[PDB]
Enzyme design. Sequence first.
Site, short mmCIF file in Angstrom:
data_model
loop_
_atom_site.label_atom_id
_atom_site.label_comp_id
_atom_site.label_asym_id
_atom_site.label_seq_id
_atom_site.Cartn_x
_atom_site.Cartn_y
_atom_site.Cartn_z
N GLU A 188 0.83 -1.20 0.00
CA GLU A 188 0.00 0.00 0.00
C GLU A 188 0.87 1.25 0.00
O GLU A 188 0.43 2.32 0.42
CB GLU A 188 -0.91 0.01 1.24
CG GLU A 188 -1.74 -1.26 1.43
CD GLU A 188 -2.62 -1.57 0.23
OE1 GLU A 188 -2.81 -0.67 -0.62
OE2 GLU A 188 -3.12 -2.72 0.13
N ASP A 229 -1.51 -2.55 -9.33
CA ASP A 229 -1.74 -3.87 -8.77
C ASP A 229 -1.84 -4.72 -10.03
O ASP A 229 -2.68 -4.45 -10.88
CB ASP A 229 -3.07 -3.94 -8.01
CG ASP A 229 -3.00 -3.31 -6.63
OD1 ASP A 229 -1.89 -3.17 -6.09
OD2 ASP A 229 -4.07 -2.98 -6.08
#
Length: 509
Positions: free
Chosen positions: A184, A345
């Site tokens: 993250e 991602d």
Amino acid sequence: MARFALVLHAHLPYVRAHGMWPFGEETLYEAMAETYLPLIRVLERLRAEGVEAPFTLGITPILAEQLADARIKEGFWAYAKDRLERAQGDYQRYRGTALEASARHQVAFWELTLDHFQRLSGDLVAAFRKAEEGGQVELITSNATHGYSPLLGYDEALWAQIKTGVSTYRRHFAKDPTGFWLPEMAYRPKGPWKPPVEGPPEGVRPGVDELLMRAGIRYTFVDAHLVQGGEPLSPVESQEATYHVHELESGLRVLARNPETTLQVWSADYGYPGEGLYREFHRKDPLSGLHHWRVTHRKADLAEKAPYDPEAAFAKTEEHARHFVGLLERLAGRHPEGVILSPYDAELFGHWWYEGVAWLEAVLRLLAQNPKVRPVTAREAVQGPAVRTALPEGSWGRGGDHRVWLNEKTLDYWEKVYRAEGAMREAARRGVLPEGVLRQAMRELLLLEASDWPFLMETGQAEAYARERYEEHARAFFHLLKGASPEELRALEERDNPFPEADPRLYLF
């Protein structure tokens, strides 16, 4: 010459032996078939055709551990075989209909999937290793189980996460990683730290980058607002700071996420995936479960989705590839010597955006022969002049801070994480429990520290599941320390088997 660093971060929490659906082993099987295998095929082609357009790929340690697992490999094989049969059945049902073309595509896709998986001896990790060996991509590692770096209560716990990740990388690739993906993009600089909940000691803690440095890592990535202040990407313009390579006091270098390239792909209003010809993610066949429809229109109802046209959809990726490269050339014009970091991602391409992997290949092929924008690995991207910078604390999550993983619904979670991390540390010092018990307990701690649990509860993607998941790893962790029987230990060792060489010493110093 503007440098373009494409960075794909492949990740999935530990789902092996914890159910198959909704969020289970099938989630891993889908990613393998829709993202990882197609990606490997792109890498094989570029190498075969001599195309020079390197990018960076991260595979979280916990993901690699599952990909290299015997049960997962066999499980994927059964999955693919079953899908092929479902595809063949759909082709007979839909032959001569508007869904025929889509049904044919499914058959061809799964045939290729089984054949490719079989030709690789079902070992995806080995193929990625081969690709890195060819220079087609740089592989980077991350926290063992994608723990949320800033909030882990102990430096020794964060150290274990980082070090176990580096070790897993070495074990699988026989090389040391220089690049690191911060889960993250969560960062915390050196300085006074007070626990969000009771447990950890309050005091001065080293910066996350200092531990990375000590682990042999030379660079990582952070969100744009950490280097240019202002609003995070929860319109955010790209200040000049985002195009510079940044060097921290520790000596570690960092690249900042480019907003435009992120929004151009992920935006729900103008991101490429929203294009009407692309395959609709949310509509599955009532009998087969396969995807046969296209987006059609962003507002469109599921019942209003039109038949999927495979040919038209993939042809469209060429157009979006040119458009994307156009944007890279404008950014480059604005900063001829800057570095454009486009980190995503990995599962976005192939799983969320079905045609996304073909798009990636198209983009790389165009960039190999582009005079204004040069595709490079992260390592090459961080070379040359750098701005000495100090980074505030933050992440690339909603709000640019920790609200997504730290909140009302996750207090109990961090509470148990902190207690467990402290116990692990103690158990490691005492060294009285059996070696195996210490290793498995460590595994339970690591699994518990997965940021996926607090994430899945706050988002709502699988709240009850995630809650039970972290509660069970916590439960297994303390049960192992308090005293479990030999057979209870073995049942946990088999159920939760990542990190065959987990090293409890990491919790010491």
